[PDB]
Design an enzyme around this catalytic site. Structure first.
Site, PDB file in Angstrom:
ATOM      1  N   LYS A 139      10.319 -24.669   0.094  1.00  0.00           N
ATOM      2  CA  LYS A 139      10.088 -24.894  -1.342  1.00  0.00           C
ATOM      3  C   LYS A 139      10.550 -26.267  -1.827  1.00  0.00           C
ATOM      4  CE  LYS A 139      10.107 -19.970  -2.128  1.00  0.00           C
ATOM      5  NZ  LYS A 139      10.388 -19.640  -0.670  1.00  0.00           N
TER       6      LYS A 139
HETATM    7  N1  LIG Z   1       8.450 -17.763  -0.559  1.00  0.00           N
HETATM    8  C1  LIG Z   1       8.640 -16.695  -1.338  1.00  0.00           C
HETATM    9  C2  LIG Z   1       8.068 -16.678  -2.598  1.00  0.00           C
HETATM   10  F1  LIG Z   1       7.480 -17.788  -3.150  1.00  0.00           F
HETATM   11  C3  LIG Z   1       8.191 -15.497  -3.303  1.00  0.00           C
HETATM   12  O1  LIG Z   1       7.700 -15.384  -4.541  1.00  0.00           O
HETATM   13  N2  LIG Z   1       8.814 -14.416  -2.796  1.00  0.00           N
HETATM   14  C4  LIG Z   1       9.329 -14.502  -1.549  1.00  0.00           C
HETATM   15  O2  LIG Z   1       9.883 -13.399  -1.060  1.00  0.00           O
HETATM   16  N3  LIG Z   1       9.269 -15.622  -0.806  1.00  0.00           N
HETATM   17  C5  LIG Z   1       9.824 -15.722   0.558  1.00  0.00           C
HETATM   18  O3  LIG Z   1       9.109 -14.831   1.388  1.00  0.00           O
HETATM   19  C6  LIG Z   1       9.982 -14.111   2.275  1.00  0.00           C
HETATM   20  C7  LIG Z   1       9.916 -12.628   1.927  1.00  0.00           C
HETATM   21  O4  LIG Z   1      10.478 -11.953   3.052  1.00  0.00           O
HETATM   22  P1  LIG Z   1      10.684 -10.349   3.078  1.00  0.00           P
HETATM   23  O5  LIG Z   1      10.928  -9.896   1.664  1.00  0.00           O
HETATM   24  O6  LIG Z   1      11.867 -10.190   3.995  1.00  0.00           O
HETATM   25  O7  LIG Z   1       9.422  -9.796   3.660  1.00  0.00           O
HETATM   26  C8  LIG Z   1      11.358 -14.761   2.125  1.00  0.00           C
HETATM   27  O8  LIG Z   1      11.392 -15.900   3.004  1.00  0.00           O
HETATM   28  C9  LIG Z   1      11.303 -15.268   0.686  1.00  0.00           C
HETATM   29  O9  LIG Z   1      12.266 -16.301   0.477  1.00  0.00           O
END
Ligand SMILES: Nc1c(F)c(=O)[nH]c(=O)n1[C@@H]1O[C@H](COP(=O)(O)O)[C@@H](O)[C@H]1O
Ligand SMILES: Nc1c(F)c(=O)[nH]c(=O)n1[C@@H]1O[C@H](COP(=O)(O)O)[C@@H](O)[C@H]1O
Lengths: 323, 331
Positions: A139
């Site tokens: 990000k």
């Molecule tokens: N990049 C993200 C977004 F923009 C967002 O809106 N929500 C997210 O969860 N992530 C990332 O997506 C992943 C979610 O992972 P899991 O819940 O374990 O399946 C993690 O790396 C979060 O940081």
């Protein structure tokens, strides 16, 4: 040398899914791996050691190739490095046959200082050897002079195919992320559009311009910059992160940007609805709707089976949509 | 120790005490690029390691965490006996050099994470030694990383920044949502509180496209975001615990600086953009002025770090700032 659009399409034709496996190992996962491996006599680390490409990682390969029993007693200072890296290789080994893409969130690799960045590099090298599309989820955001450091780290050092970017500061930053004028190189990214956090509406939906909510404005501006950079012609893209709990926004984005690449986290641990998400975000070129699943695979006692479960669920939905 | 703490408790207190002693609001940015490191290595070769020898006589170099043994070696011995540590050594010595030459003029140092990552692990080792070094000197710190994620993820950055580096503060982008601050500026499981600056108005030339053009309820997005940040600070009880959430407001954003200081009278502002970029020091410091000067940090990076006379460059900014603070106090 082939652009990311082409690499992704080719992988999609080979494995026929849009599952994106998230590899976000936390301190407990690493501790649990060391504990479980001590109990099962290092069953999974022994499998890791038999894989071809462990011989190709560039950082502390000799340490990684040691027997687990030798590390704990005679290399105590390398113990965390070893088990952290081997956890990552274990997940990748168990699940890669089901994965269109792997996404690694940088936050999980930094909090121990340098050691986790060595692990991260080894993970990216290992995926590169396996020829599996990669996303570094960091990000990133800054002014142009500063952000060029992330372009280097992500696209030159890690050799990632893509990264995530927060363009709230502006879209001009993307000129120094997705393009390197001196090297004449083009890279792909996904910009944050609608996120999964419970209060995501507070800026993404409440703020507006010209009768359009901020997430729509931000998606438009990201595409305007992709067009400016001529990324499509260079086989790269700027896509959108849209949460897997954000069904109306997923539908709006796919409706108004029918050609766009979408990355969708939130299924599993965050309890997003897979059917609604994949249906709303659907594209017949389904590499354009990546479904990310992290903890629901990595914290499952049987990550191969967890990945298979989601691969099967996704494919059933793709079949329905192919009618 | 199990007794009531006797040292400063909280970034607010740490900033005020240093401001009282050194009478400035200069924030020195330490953003070393590949050229800076190259140049230092070359210049030191050419001046018989004048500056590294000076570094080696400072006491707190003895308290850094990582590869201290290597850092304490004579430079010629590094080149011949520890060649695979050369880059680590010269990178870490350039940072110590800048810190030694300029710290007496600095209310705080801001390190932008981006400059420490592009070589892989080696730069993170340098970053940690830099934070260790500043901690020993008891100089307030800011890790500029503009972190943002969901709660479960961002906790990792809280750990890295506030437990591992032991930074006093960090920068945060709250576009994803304000609630992320509950997992950055607060640790419920330890009852600890930490300070941050959220992005409000930035210096990049297209910064208006979201921060100004987006709106809600007759307020521009930057105002909405500032208000939400302040509301979260109150919810988290930061200021009762001697911490705060402040605002990054670019040094070329005069109207917004005035608005922010006018409508959030006692807020902490961090303002980059003077020197290398197009910011104007007099206009910035005047609009953002507060009698508690530490609430208007004026960041200067490249104009100091790329100067061949960094101490004198730092002194000149310190002097200019002090003259302007004088005009605004009414001499
Ligand atoms: N990049 C993200 C977004 F923009 C967002 O809106 N929500 C997210 O969860 N992530 C990332 O997506 C992943 C979610 O992972 P899991 O819940 O374990 O399946 C993690 O790396 C979060 O940081
Ligand atoms: N954090 C920032 C902002 F929100 C912003 O709007 N503008 C910035 O320049 N920075 C950072 O401030 C520093 C500017 O450094 P110098 O130009 O060399 O004096 C760099 O670290 C930038 O990344």
């Amino acid at each position: 040398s082939m652009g990311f659009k082409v690499k992704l399409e080719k992988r999609r034709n080979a494995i026929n899914t849009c599952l994106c496996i998230g590899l976000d190992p936390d301190e407990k996962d690493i501790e649990n791996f060391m504990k479980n491996e001590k109990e099962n006599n290092y069953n999974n680390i022994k499998k890791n050691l038999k894989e071809k490409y462990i011989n190709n990682v560039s950082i502390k390969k000799d340490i990684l190739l040691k027997a687990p029993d030798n590390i704990i007693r005679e290399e105590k200072s390398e113990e965390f490095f070893y088990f952290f890296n081997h956890f990552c290789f274990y997940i990748i080994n168990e699940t890669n046959k089901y994965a269109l893409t792997f996404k690694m969130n940088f936050a999980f690799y930094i909090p121990y200082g340098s050691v986790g960045i060595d692990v991260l590099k080894n993970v990216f090298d290992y995926l590169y050897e396996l020829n599996i599309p990669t996303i570094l989820d960091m990000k990133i955001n800054d002014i142009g002079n500063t952000v060029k450091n992330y372009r280097k780290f992500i696209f030159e050092y890690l050799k990632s195919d893509s990264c995530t970017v927060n363009i709230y500061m502006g879209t001009n930053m993307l000129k120094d992320i997705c393009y390197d004028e001196e090297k004449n190189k083009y890279y792909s990214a996904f910009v944050l559009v609608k996120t999964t956090n419970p209060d995501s509406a507070i800026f993404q939906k409440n703020l507006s311009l010209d009768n359009k909510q901020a997430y729509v404005i931000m998606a438009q501006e990201a595409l305007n910059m992709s067009s400016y950079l001529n990324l499509e012609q260079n086989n790269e893209f700027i896509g959108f992160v849209v949460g897997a709990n954000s069904y109306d926004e997923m539908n709006y984005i796919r409706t108004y940007f029918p050609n766009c690449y979408i990355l969708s986290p939130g299924i599993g641990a965050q309890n997003g609805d897979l059917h609604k998400t994949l249906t709303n975000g659907y594209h017949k070129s389904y590499e354009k709707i990546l479904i990310n699943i992290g903890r629901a695979i990595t914290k499952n006692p049987y990550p191969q089976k967890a990945a298979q479960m989601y691969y099967d669920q996704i494919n059933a939905i793709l079949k329905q949509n192919m009618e």
